[PDB]
Amino acid sequence: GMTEYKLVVVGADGVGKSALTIQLIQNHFVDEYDPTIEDSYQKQVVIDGETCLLDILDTAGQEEYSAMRDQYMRTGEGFLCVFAINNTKSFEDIHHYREQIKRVKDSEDVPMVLVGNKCDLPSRTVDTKQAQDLARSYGIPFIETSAKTRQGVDDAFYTLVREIRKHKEK
Numbered sequence: 001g002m003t004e005y006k007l008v009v010v011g012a013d014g015v016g017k018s019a020l021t022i023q024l025i026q027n028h029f030v031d032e033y034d035p036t037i038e039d040s041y042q043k044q045v046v047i048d049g050e051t052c053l054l055d056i057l058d059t060a061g062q063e064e065y066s067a068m069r070d071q072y073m074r075t076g077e078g079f080l081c082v083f084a085i086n087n088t089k090s091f092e093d094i095h096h097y098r099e100q101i102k103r104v105k106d107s108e109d110v111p112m113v114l115v116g117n118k119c120d121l122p123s124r125t126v127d128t129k130q131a132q133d134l135a136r137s138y139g140i141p142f143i144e145t146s147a148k149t150r151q152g153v154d155d156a157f158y159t160l161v162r163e164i165r166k167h168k169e170k
């Protein structure tokens with residue numbers, strides 16, 4: 001058989017949410033993708049031997065309330081919370097996004113993965129260990145990625161699927 005997973009990608013604009021999503025759905029690096037486009041994208045993959053259909057909401061324009069975004073997040077099964085490792089502000093914003101998720105999911109056990117993107121870049125400002133501390137305080141995995149080189153992309157999305165699987169077993 002197959003299983004579907006409803007995923008949401010959140011984080012400051014410019015962190016690489018669209019680039020990460022497109023690496024998953026199309027397997028290459030799209031460096032210019034309209035920063036205002038928010039949409040969902042479907043991709044069939046295989047994870048741990050199981051056929052999986054992922055439906056991924058790539059968020060954008062979070063400065064304005066969107067009812068469609070809110071309804072998708074309310075029913076979303078798991079969340080990637082993305083920052084860029086060369087942008088300290090995007091890391092400090094993670095708290096805002098996790099609050100926003102737990103605010104709309106009525107739960108403190110929501111499948112989530114913290115993602116530090118742009119790890120191909122040399123001028124890092126957020127140490128891996130600082131991000132590991134934050135993920136531990138939330139009880140969630142931390143995965144480093146580069147949408148440019150594809151490093152860690154499958155790891156981030158597949159780890160989220162694995163977290164959802166465990167949650168659904170409860």
Ligand SMILES: Nc1nc2c(ncn2[C@@H]2O[C@H](COP(=O)(O)OP(=O)(O)O)[C@@H](O)[C@H]2O)c(=O)[nH]1
Binds near residue numbers: 015017030148
């Ligand atoms: N070097 C590098 N640049 C990236 C990476 N991911 C995204 N970018 C660039 O970061 C900027 C924002 O990417 P985008 O996917 O539009 O981010 P979004 O606003 O979160 O959807 C663009 O200039 C991308 O080319 C990455 O992993 N490495």
Ligand SMILES: [Mg+2]
Binds near residue numbers: 017
């Ligand atoms: Mg985008």
